[PDB]
Design a protein around this ligand. Sequence first.
Ligand SMILES: O=C1CCCCN1Cc1cccc(-c2ccsc2)c1
Length: 188
Amino acid sequence: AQYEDGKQYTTLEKPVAGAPQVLEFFSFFCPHCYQFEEVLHISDNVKKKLPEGVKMTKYHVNFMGGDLGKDLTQAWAVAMALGVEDKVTVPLFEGVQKTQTIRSASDIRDVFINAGIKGEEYDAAWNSFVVKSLVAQQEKAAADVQLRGVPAMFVNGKYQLNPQGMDTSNMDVFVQQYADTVKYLSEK
Ligand SMILES: O=C1CCCCN1Cc1cccc(-c2ccsc2)c1
């Protein structure tokens, strides 16, 4: 058919009840994730085509980058809690992969300070139980699908995007095929 299980998406054999409608996972250590976000703008283009009433959730993962990877999951929790994802995503990706200036939790904190988050505000969030809970929520969602690779996107706990089955000769066409597939899946 036009959209086929095994081509543009795969189907989870253990569907996850109560999962977010559209769930993206990434790591700031993940090279394809840098491409998805900084070059292809996958999340934004998926969001822009989602049906009314379908919201997007994006979570960081621990399994890349050891200690610093876990610090980045916690910092992503701070970003979600403060609502500053759109201020820190670019400098976190560039700090880890472009300039390689993020080597410690303090260096992560510097990105937030430079982005205008006050030091007391960042530190209060970093140490908060609201943020511990958001870390737990990120870990649980990844565990629910036994996640071992990023980038990854899941729709309604049932379907997983399969970008490896899409033509990569034109970036723009690839992005809208991916977004159109997410829309299709959300309408199933
Ligand atoms: O290599 C793959 C195979 C599957 C799709 C995800 N990626 C990562 C990627 C990174 C940067 C650009 C592109 C791309 C798309 C269309 S033209 C160029 C693709």
